[model samples]
Target: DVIELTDDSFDKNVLDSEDVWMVEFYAPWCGHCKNLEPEWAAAASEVKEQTKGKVKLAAVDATVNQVLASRYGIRGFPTIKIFQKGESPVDYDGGRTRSDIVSRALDLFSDN
Candidate 1:
């Protein structure tokens, strides 16, 4: 499942947590974000089982969570970032398909 996050929950649920996180910062009105939604959700389910909860997928409404979007320097509508405890977040520039997301997520889980 993709955890719905806000500016308040970001620190506790992601930054401070031990698990690795793939967070998508998106604007509600963006069409590309809407297109990616189903792919992200599908990838989340597969990632959860494969990673055994070590990695998680999450979404942040950039329009509402200005703090997080600003902190992450979000210049685009749908910005995908990977977060690991104690490390700086990185951009996820892989393919937007479910297979692509899942493979990259699994790779992140294994690498860390």
Candidate 2:
């Protein structure tokens, strides 16, 4: 399951999560965000199955969690960030496909 994150919990959830984390930053009011939800869920499920608890999937409402969004310089909806241990999150833009996002994240974690 994808964990819902808030500004208050983002630090502990994403920033300090033990496993590799992927956060999908979205705004509830955005049409694009709503459109991407299913794709994101599918991707999260795929990651969860493949990693077998080695990775975590999370989502944050950018409208409500502005602090966390701003910290990452988010300017758009449906942005994905991959966070790994001992390294800063690598923000990915214009990614709308599960394969793209998953492959990128797997590559990042594999390299680190």
Candidate 3:
């Protein structure tokens, strides 16, 4: 299951976590985001299996987490941000395929 994050627990659940995190910023009403849900879920599961808990996946409701959305400059739905401890989140966009997302996520954490 993909972890659900909110403005209240985002810091503790994501930013402060020891594992590398991939956060999907999505709005419920967005068509593209809705379309991406399955791919995101599959990518999350695949990452968990491949990394064996070395990587983590979480999602935030951009419509609800206004502060976080603004902070991250989320102008569109389904923006993926990869976060590592003690470093700023590196943002990615337009990765619609599961393989593309998983590959980008792996590359992101590999350099850290």
Candidate 4:
């Protein structure tokens, strides 16, 4: 499942976790973000189960969580980041498909 993150909870939920996370920074009003919603949800379940919780999928509402958006240098509507433990988050430069998301999570999980 996908966890909704806010400025306050971001560190506790993501930065503190040992699991790797695929975090989507999105604005609710953005058209591309709306299109990504379903794909993200579909990938969340698969990533959760396949990773056995070793990897996670989460979201931050950029419009609501201005702190996180600015901190992460969010320039677009739905920017994705890969958060690995003890390391800086990296841009998710992959396909938007559910399978692509799932595959990336599995790649991280295996490396972990």
Q: For this target, which candidate reaches the highest lDDT against the unseen true structure? A: 1
How many residue pairs collide in each prediction?
Answer: 0, 0, 0, 0
Q: Can you tell me which runs of candidate 2 are displaced by over 4 Å?
A: none
Tens-place lDDT digits, model 2, residues 38-96: 88888888877877757777898888878887888998877878788767788866476
lDDT (Cα, tens digit) per residue for candidate 1, span 1-112 = 9999998889999988989999999999999999989989999999999998899999999999999888999999789999998999999989988889988888888887
Task: Extract clashing residue pairs from model 4.
Answer: none
lDDT string for model 3 (15-101, tens) is 777788888899899888888888888988988877776787889998989999988899886788888988888876646677887
Ranking by TM-score: 1, 4, 3, 2
RMSD of 3: 1.6
Better of 1 and 4 by lDDT: 1
User: Which residue runs of candidate 4 sit more than 4 Å off their true CA positions?
Assistant: none
Clashes of 3: 0
Cα lDDT of model 4 by residue, 28-87, tens digit: 899999998989999999987887889989999999899998898998878999999888
Q: Lowest lDDT 10-mer window, candidate 2?
A: 103-112
- What C-alpha lDDT does candidate 2 achieve relative to the native structure? 0.79
RMSD (CA, Å), candidate 2 to true, equals 1.8
- Ten residues in sequence with the least summed lDDT for candidate 4: 45-54
